[PDB]
Amino acid sequence: KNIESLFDYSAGQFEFIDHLLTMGVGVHFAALIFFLVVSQFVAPKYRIATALSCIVMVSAGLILNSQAVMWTDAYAYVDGSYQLQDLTFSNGYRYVNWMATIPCLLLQLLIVLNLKGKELFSTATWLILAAWGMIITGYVGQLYEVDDIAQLMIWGAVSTAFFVVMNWIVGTKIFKNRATMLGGTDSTITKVFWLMMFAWTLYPIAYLVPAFMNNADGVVLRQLLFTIADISSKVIYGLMITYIAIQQSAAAGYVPAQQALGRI
Numbered sequence: 422k423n424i425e426s427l428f429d430y431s432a433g434q435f436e437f438i439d440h441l442l443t444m445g446v447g448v449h450f451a452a453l454i455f456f457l458v459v460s461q462f463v464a465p466k467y468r469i470a471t472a473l474s475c476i477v478m479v480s481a482g483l484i485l486n487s488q489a490v491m492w493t494d495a496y497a498y499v500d501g502s503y504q505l506q507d508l509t510f511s512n513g514y515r516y517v518n519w520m521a522t523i524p525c526l527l528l529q530l531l532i533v534l535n536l537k538g539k540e541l542f543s544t545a546t547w548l549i550l551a552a553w554g555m556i557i558t559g560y561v562g563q564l565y566e567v568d569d570i571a572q573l574m575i576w577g578a579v580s581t582a583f584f585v586v587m588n589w590i591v592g593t594k595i596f597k598n599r600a601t602m603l604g605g606t607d608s609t610i611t612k613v614f615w616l617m618m619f620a621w622t623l624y625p626i627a628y629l630v631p632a633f634m635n636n637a638d639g640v641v642l643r644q645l646l647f648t649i650a651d652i653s654s655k656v657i658y659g660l661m662i663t664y665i666a667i668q669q670s671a672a673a674g675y676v677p678a679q680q681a682l683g684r685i
């Protein structure tokens with residue numbers, strides 16, 4: 422049901438996609454160790470924001486690892502090209518993983534925005550419901566990326582509605598709570614918003630690839646877009662969230678944070 426299954430791949434195409442996924446694994450698990458070691462310099466009220474980056478690194482790293490092995494399982498070099506065998510490859514498992522990873526990305530944002538208690542629980546709940554609506558409708562949509570492009574487009578429009586509303590909740594909370602933030606991170610959090618708008622928008626572009634580039638090179642392009650998007654939305658994002666957490670920790674008087682920033 423996926424466009425990947427439609428084509429044979431050149432050695433170059435096949436190996437490049439393998440390398441993209443493998444590099445993806447390496448970057449996320451390398452970042453994992455960084456987040457782990459810097460977590461001790463985060464104040465208790467923000468430390469979970471850095472823990473969530475560890476959780477996202479392993480979750481994302483595992484899905485990329487799984488995709489890479491699925492890729493090599495599904496294709497074998499036969500008569501001069503990589504051809505589909507008995508096992509299958511699908512990006513559908515990425516969508517399932519987003520059900521977990523996107524709530525984690527959203528939660529760590531709410532934490533460094535200094536949301537607490539009732540507002541935190543209510544905002545997270547609405548955000549996660551919007552996100553799940555987006556992911557589920559998008560998942561249904563990509564079931565038709567070969568059979569019914571029109572249906573892909575309509576489910577995509579519904580998903581985009583959830584996306585836009587989710588982004589509005591995010592922006593509203595960011596620009597409202599920006600003033601509460603310490604150590605100059607009121608400025609930093611503004612860049613985080615724009616990073617999210619940029620990086621998360623790469624995913625619907627990848628979703629539309631079967632509509633505007635239904636060939637083997639389109640398959641490469643989509644994996645390339647996912648790679649840019651994953652690294653930006655999880656790793657670069659996580660680094661900014663952790664920076665914000667440490668900076669606010671230091672400004673709040675947490676001595677390990679002050680000491681850590683002092684060494685650099």
Ligand SMILES: *C/C=C(C)/C=C/C=C(C)/C=C/C1=C(C)CCCC1(C)C
Nearest residue numbers: 556559580581584621624625628654
């Ligand atoms: C780490 C993974 C992330 C941040 C994934 C984000 C995914 C999206 C923003 C997906 C958006 C979609 C649309 C807005 C329309 C087409 C269907 C989706 C689900 C690909």
Ligand SMILES: CCCCCCCC/C=C\CCCCCCCC(=O)O
Nearest residue numbers: 433434435437641645648649652653
């Ligand atoms: C934050 C951005 C992270 C970027 C990650 C992607 C790094 C590698 C990017 C690709 C370089 C272009 C490779 C040339 C493609 C050759 C075409 C092919 O062989 O199929």
Ligand SMILES: [Cl-]
Nearest residue numbers: 464465466467
């Ligand atoms: Cl604290």
Ligand SMILES: [Cl-]
Nearest residue numbers: 481518519522
């Ligand atoms: Cl993920």
